[PDB]
Every structure is written in structure tokens, then in C-alpha cells.
Design a protein around this ligand. Structure first.
Ligand SMILES: NC(=O)c1ccc[n+]([C@@H]2O[C@H](COP(=O)([O-])OP(=O)(O)OC[C@H]3O[C@@H](n4cnc5c(N)ncnc54)[C@H](OP(=O)(O)O)[C@@H]3O)[C@@H](O)[C@H]2O)c1
Ligand SMILES: NC(=O)c1ccc[n+]([C@@H]2O[C@H](COP(=O)([O-])OP(=O)(O)OC[C@H]3O[C@@H](n4cnc5c(N)ncnc54)[C@H](OP(=O)(O)O)[C@@H]3O)[C@@H](O)[C@H]2O)c1
Lengths: 381, 381
């Protein structure tokens, strides 16, 4: 009946794990600010398992097949001949994660005659073309706050890694060297620097709370300013615009969604506004930053470092210039798919599927598109 | 007259820097808790310069030769035929940095007929044999607090780096891969975990303040408990002994000096007390952890990661097992010699020399051994 097409990334090359490094995941009561953790009616997995790969199946097979649904799992997602595009024509639901995203391009949504729900197992639905989903009445949902703390932790890690020159230094240790001067001729403390966040949402504000005790000057921007109390707790400095903020910052971190208003906000023009030796960490989306502008700004010294886990095209080509540029601290798109995060957004995925199929309302936090218009968290993009 | 022997690390392999990545270091007013930054009569360098390598000379040659002292700088420090051992015979002062340490072994202190001051440009004087210094009336001093905050940043960066599996993931990025499942089959959030510090000194407490907003549970141990007032601010949980603390901790960080009571405090015996999949970050000294005990603990799964910048011997042999073990996030000893940190301990170095040669007292907080007994900070070992 209702076909669920599920696009997950490949198992590890040495095989799906028969052992994890630890015996249980920490208990998270609620998210900061009070949003409750996902509330499926049950879960068919043990928290800490690898839920996000083809063998993990997000703990959904037994649930869906119990309610008579077809459940198709694949990692083959790129191309017109891919298993995704072939099973897409009559799928009722599509689930994919931003880390290995099933791109729902305009022509693919055109092919998906039966599609009623496009479900982002994670946060951020920029791989689903909103224009078509709004036009065609498809519902688009995501698991709000599932990995925001995971990404916030990754962000602070990469800031410190860039300022202190971690990645090149570790190369010297693994390669048999010592080379103190080679490591530290590009190594600074973060202490006292000015850090600016584009976006003080769930990730952005979590980053700012975590940076406060490093004795840094915290600046931020977005469309709607935060309440003074919050600004004063952390000592935040507000800016109407991004461009007003960049010249102040030793470090800039990006923490906004990807839609047209924010695409290529970091480019050859805006990059001129940064101090010399500025650092950028982008854990939001790759297309927020003009790819080759970052490279050129690295090669010229405008930037002393770039780091992130987000790229475009998500499965970044082996030749992607960010992989080999100087002063890079990049990782694949992994921040939001830590084993701790997977436990939450796999339950959230199930909560949404239960709500969708039982005729119960999908959390307003979760909603991006519903009933042919933006809805819930999507209306606030 | 009066010879000052100074051991510094080599210049970068591609040459001493002419163009630095940034234009200026942030201005730090005082250290946390109120200790004033170093107070020399002048500095003959620009903060942000590379003062710790042989060409930097810690900004000391012009000062020293102005007052008639001989000034000898070398990086050749290990071996009986080394320039350091052949110049130590009649040196009145010896300066070396922990990151490239001139080991003042008992046999070398015996040959040092004119030695009166052993100045640690940094923190931790374990490269100088304490017993011989006490027996011989030599003064031993270090620039307390000069890079305690720098190390606190390195620790939190390496905790996150280990828990989240940063280094192996970056290898997947630089090598042309994607391999999400390979990265995250060993990646967790830090949120909610329990972190324990051995030592809540200048580094330890700075680490604990920085970990608070990560929503981790914070434990600590040392010989003397901290004021509950402070304990209640960070929500610290106190433990009488280390062995009492280890079973609770998902992460343990070592932040104590190297003495007999702390040497090899992590060994095949105590490691049995750790949770499976525990993380250790050691930015204190290499000999706090039995080298092969760590390796064995990694291979068995007792530890899910080991990271630090401190090893033994330093310089670490190319075959050091910590450089190639699984789940390692090592860097050479660089935390305390970031360009920001060098500016401070090069000034402190000059302050102490001025105090020493002018007959003015060295600050109590700088003193380790003086006049045949432990002194100042060294009295608190
Ligand atoms: N694993 C990963 O790498 C990963 C994981 C999760 C999310 N992400 C990315 O991070 C983004 C943010 O996540 P989050 O949980 O922090 O989201 P959120 O709670 O929706 O916060 C988004 C923030 O963007 C700000 N913003 C500033 N300019 C904006 C603009 N022009 N359009 C829209 N928003 C703008 C918003 O403030 P105002 O709109 O009020 O100005 C808001 O503070 C996601 O949408 C996704 O793209 C990445
Ligand atoms: N990697 C680097 O670049 C770098 C840089 C600076 C320092 N370090 C290392 O880090 C060490 C600590 O630095 P710091 O600035 O935090 O020093 P500190 O201010 O002297 O603090 C040392 C701490 O160790 C605690 N401690 C616990 N057990 C101890 C024992 N058995 N004996 C002595 N002290 C004990 C002390 O508290 P109690 O007295 O109550 O026990 C104290 O809080 C240095 O000595 C050095 O070895 C490394």
C-alpha cells in the first residue's frame, strides 16, 4: 500500500557494527528552552545503535510493516537511474537525512505522483525543493532540535581547532614529527577574541552559551533580535545586518537555514569585510558560502581558517577544493548524525510517521510545509 | 661574567615567519582570579611574534647583553655531546621550555658548577630534577598561569575532538571520502556525559568553567577541596581520591603537575576502574600515564580515546606508540606555546631575570625551589 521510500547512507566499510565503544547513551530530559524530546508510541531500537545506515533502518521496518506499509531502504540516491528515482514514482513518503540527502529536485517531485510527505530525518530541508512542495500540497517535516546541540558542540570544536591549529599539528604527531614552531606559527588562543554568530537559533544560541566562558566577545545577528535578558546573560552584541558585524569578528560561525535570502551570503564581495586572518566555521549548509570564494580567500590570507561538516553537493566530489585547501578543518556531514543524535531523530521520524498515518497533527515545531503553504517552523524559516 | 644558557626549539622548516596570519593579539588584563600578567621593565618584541624558537630568542638578547651578561641560545639539547651539555658546565642561568625541554638530570646538575637559576619558560618544572635542585640551593622558577587558559582551551577542544571522532572523520574528508557511517559508528554528543578533572588548579578550574554550558556533569579531585561557594557555581561534585572518581566519568582530564605522587597515576591497575569506552585527555605531562598502559587500554576497548599534547620523552621518538594508536587525537606539545601564550611567558621570563639579577624578590607564585627548600608555589607542589 502506502510505500515509504527511505534513503540512508551505506553501512561502514568494515561492516555494520557488532559492538559499540560504550554501553549506554546519556539521558537528555528536554531541550534547552523546554521543547520535549520526540514522543513516538514506541521504539524498536536501543539508543546508541547505528540507526542512520541501510542496516539501521531508523528502527522503522517492524512498525511500518505491522501497519501494512511497504518499506524500501536504499543508499542509491544520485542519478536518474538510481533506485531512488525508480521507486520515487509511486512513493507516498520519502525519508532522507541531510547527511546523505535524497535530492527532491523539481523534476523528481514532478515524477512522484503519489508523494504526500517528505520527511527530513534531521534538521534542514533545503534538499527538498520548497517551491514544488508548496505547489503540490506535499507536507514537509523535520525533527526540530534533534541535533542542534550536537552541531553546537561540533562548532565550538572546530573554532578551537582552527584558532589553535589542531589538524596540522596532529598531522605532525601522526607523521613522526615534533615541529613545535611549525605548528604554533599559526596557533593562537581563542581567549579575548571576538566571535560572531550568524543566527542565534537553537544551534546558534547553544554555540554562544558554550563560548561565553572562553572569555570571548560574543556578537550575533538575525532578522528578529533576541530578548535583552538573554543578550545580557551572555553579554551578546546585536547587529541589524551581517555586513555590519563581520569587520568586528576574529571568528564567524554560520548557524542559519539555507533558503534564497541566505544563499551565498559568504562570497568574494562580503569576504572583503572580514579582518585579515578571520576564521569561518560553517556547520549550517555548504551553499551559504561561495565555494571558490572560500578557497581564494584562504589562498590570499583573508581567511586564516575554514571548517565545517556541510558541503554542496552533499556527497562532495573527491575533487572538492575544500578537502585539500590550506587551513581547513573539515569533516564529512556528520555533526547531526552522531549516535546520540540518531537516537533522537529516529524517534522523531517515527513520531511524525505515526502522527501522519493516524490522522493526528504533526508537531507545529516539526512542520515546514503543510496544506500548500508554509507552516509551523517553516513559516519562520 | 654571567652566562645565561637558553634552549629553544628550531625555527619552522620553511623558515622563520615574516608574514603572520593576523595583525594583533587580543589584550588580556589579568588572569582569572586576579593574578597580574607578567610585569617586566620592558619587552623587546611585538606580541604575536614567534618568541619560543631559536630566532625569536624570547626577546632577551638586547636586554641581557646590555647588562653585560653572556647569552647563549641553542636547540641542541639532548646527548652528552650536545651544545647544551657543553655550555652548562659554567652557565649561571638555564632557560628552557617544556615543549623543547633542556633536561636537568641529576648527572647534568652535577656538571653545572655555576648554576644558580633554572627558569622554566612555561609551567611545570619536571624536566629539572627537583631533588638535586633542593640539595644544591639552585632556584627553580616558572611563569605561573602564563598559559593555563591556553591549555584549558586545548583540553576542551580535545575532549570534543575525541567524543565526536573529529580526527578520523577529517581523515575521511582529506582523503576524498564521505563515509558517514564509518565516521559516526564511533561518534557521540558530549551533552549529558560526566567529566572528571584530576586537579582544579589554574588549568583544571578553567577547563571546568568552560565545560559547564555543555550540560555535562562535572566531578573533580585534588588534595584540598575547593570552596563550596565555587563548587556550587559550577555544580562540581567532589571526590576524596582519584580512584573514587574514575568509575563515574565518561571523560577524565588530567591537570596536575608531575611529581612522584602523580607519576604513572594512570596505569594498567587504575585503568581497570574506568567505564568501558572512557576518554582520557592529558595536557599536563606525559608521565602521568604509563605509556604502554594507555596503548593496551585502547586495544582492549577500555578506552574509547586518548588525546593530549604532552608525551615522554620530549622530543617524542618517531616510534612513540601514542602517535599511531587507534582513537588518538595527539598533537606535539603546543598548547602552552600558542603565539598568544608565548607573548606572556616571554615577558615573565624577562621579569624573573630582572628580579634575579637585580636582587629583587621573584614573585612567590613563580617560585618552586629556592635556598635549599621548596618555595612559594613549589611549597604547594
Ligand atoms: N548536522 C548539521 O550540520 C546540521 C544539523 C542541524 C541543522 N543544521 C543547519 O542549521 C540550521 C539552523 O538550525 P537550528 O536548529 O539552529 O535552527 P533554528 O532554530 O530554526 O534557528 C535558525 C536561525 O536562523 C536565523 N536567521 C537569520 N537570518 C535568517 C534568514 N535570512 N532566514 C532564516 N533564518 C534566519 C533565525 O533567526 P530569525 O529568523 O528570527 O532572524 C534563527 O535564529 C538548519 O536549518 C540547518 O540548515 C545543520
Ligand atoms: N601542555 C602545556 O602546554 C602545559 C602548560 C601549562 C601547564 N601544564 C601542566 O599542567 C600542570 C598544572 O598547571 P596549572 O597551571 O593548572 O597548575 P597549578 O595552578 O599549580 O594547579 C595544579 C593543580 O594540581 C592539583 N593537584 C592534585 N593532586 C595533586 C598532587 N598530588 N600534587 C600536586 N598537585 C596536585 C592541585 O590542587 P591540590 O594542591 O589541592 O592537590 C592544583 O589544583 C603544570 O604543573 C604542568 O605540568 C602543561
Amino acid at each position: 500500500s502506502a510505500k515509504i521510500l527511505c534513503v540512508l547512507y551505506d553501512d561502514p566499510v568494515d561492516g555494520y557494527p557488532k559492538t559499540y565503544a560504550r554501553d549506554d547513551l546519556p539521558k537528555i530530559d528536554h531541550y534547552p528552552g523546554g521543547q520535549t524530546l520526540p514522543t513516538p508510541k514506541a521504539i524498536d531500537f536501543t539508543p546508541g545503535a547505528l540507526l542512520g545506515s541501510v542496516s539501521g533502518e531508523l528502527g522503522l521496518r517492524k512498525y511500518l510493516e505491522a501497519n501494512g506499509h511497504t518499506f524500501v531502504v536504499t543508499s542509491d540516491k544520485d542519478g536518474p537511474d538510481s533506485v531512488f528515482e525508480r521507486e520515487l514514482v509511486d512513493a507516498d513518503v520519502v525519508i532522507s537525512q541531510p547527511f546523505w540527502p535524497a535530492y527532491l529536485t523539481p523534476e523528481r517531485i514532478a515524477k512522484a505522483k503519489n508523494l504526500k510527505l517528505a520527511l527530513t530525518a534531521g534538521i534542514g530541508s533545503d534538499h527538498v525543493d520548497l517551491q514544488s512542495a508548496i505547489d503540490r500540497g506535499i507536507t514537509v517535516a523535520e525533527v526540530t532540535y534533534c541535533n542542534s546541540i550536537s552541531v553546537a558542540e561540533h562548532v565550538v570544536m572546530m573554532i578551537l581547532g582552527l584558532v589553535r591549529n589542531y589538524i596540522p599539528s596532529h598531522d605532525w604527531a601522526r607523521k613522526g614529527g615534533w615541529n613545535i614552531a611549525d605548528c604554533v606559527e599559526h596557533s593562537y588562543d581563542l581567549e579575548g577574541m571576538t566571535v560572531g554568530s550568524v543566527g542565534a537559533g537553537r544551534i546558534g544560541l547553544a554555540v554562544l552559551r558554550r563560548l561565553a566562558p572562553f572569555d570571548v566577545k560574543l556578537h550575533y545577528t538575525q532578522r528578529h533580535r533576541l530578548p535583552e535578558a538573554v543578550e545580557k546573560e551572555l553579554g551578546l552584541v546585536w547587529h541589524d545586518t551581517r555586513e555590519d558585524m563581520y569587520p568586528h569578528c576574529d571568528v564567524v560561525t554560520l548557524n542559519v537555514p539555507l533558503h534564497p535570502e541566505t544563499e551565498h551570503m559568504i562570497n568574494d564581495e562580503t569576504l572583503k569585510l572580514f579582518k585579515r586572518g578571520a576564521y569561518i566555521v560553517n556547520t549550517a549548509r555548504g551553499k551559504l558560502a561561495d565555494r571558490d570564494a572560500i578557497v581564494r580567500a584562504i589562498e590570499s590570507g583573508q581567511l586564516a581558517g575554514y571548517a565545517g561538516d556541510v558541503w554542496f553537493p552533499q556527497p562532495a566530489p573527491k575533487d572538492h577544493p575544500w578537502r585539500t585547501m590550506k587551513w581547513e578543518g573539515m569533516t564529512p556531514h556528520i555533526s547531526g548524525t552522531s549516535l546520540s543524535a540518531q537516537a533522537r531523530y529516529a524517534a522523531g521520524t517515527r513520531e511524525i510517521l505515526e502522527c501522519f498515518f493516524e490522522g493526528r497533527p504533526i508537531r507545529d515545531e516539526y512542520l515546514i510545509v503543510q496544506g500548500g503553504a508554509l507552516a509551523g517552523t517553516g513559516a519562520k524559516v
